[PDB]
């Protein structure tokens, strides 16, 4: 279905969401 | 003796929130020194309630349970975003998409932090870090 994935940013990159 | 735990990522589904819990540890009880599991919100609560109810831990302070993340409003926007099509321009869609992602990102940042802090408080506690249920929570289902 519709979901949102979240990945924590590993220093120093930024946190990220992905709409799926 | 070392125990380090954190949350690397998470997914919000229709009705559920899942967190990926990472553990690094030298403790001999574990099968591996570095491992991962997936855990829904519910299971943080089961682990918290089990601590609070266990008489062996009288005299200890149990860290507060993480709140349930609230994605309800955001999910309905996400559903509509898939459906809407109707006369929405590509430019409107892109902007709706951009703001919805920012909306989810903020909710995620806060709930991941509060779930993670709960586990890190357990791992730092000289007695609570040895709890059997906690070992199950960190390792079960490889």
From Swiss-Prot, chain B:
Q: Which parts of the sequence belong to the PX domain? A: 1-142
Family per similarity comment = Belongs to the sorting nexin family.
Q: What does this protein do?
A: May be involved in several stages of intracellular trafficking.
The name this protein carries in UniProt is Sorting nexin-32
- Recorded source organism is Homo sapiens
Show which stretch of the intact protein is covered: 24 to 165 of 403
């Amino acid at each position: 279905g519709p979901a949102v994935q979240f990945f924590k940013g590993k220093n120093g990159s930024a946190d990220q969401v992905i709409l799926v | 003796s070392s125990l380090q735990v954190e949350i690397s990522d998470a997914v919000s589904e229709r009705d559920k929130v899942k967190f990926t819990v990472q553990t690094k540890s030298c403790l001999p009880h574990f099968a591996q020194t570095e491992f991962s599991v997936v855990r829904q919100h519910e299971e943080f609560i089961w682990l918290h309630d089990a601590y609070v109810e266990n008489e062996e831990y009288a005299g200890l302070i149990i860290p507060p349970a993480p709140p349930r993340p609230d994605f309800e409003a955001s999910r309905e926007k996400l559903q509509k975003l898939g459906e809407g099509d109707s006369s929405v321009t590509r430019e409107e869609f892109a902007k709706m998409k951009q703001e919805l992602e920012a909306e989810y990102l903020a909710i995620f940042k806060k709930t991941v932090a509060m779930h993670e802090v709960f586990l890190q408080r357990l791992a730092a506690h000289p007695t609570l870090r040895r709890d059997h249920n906690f070992f199950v929570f960190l390792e079960y289902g490889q």
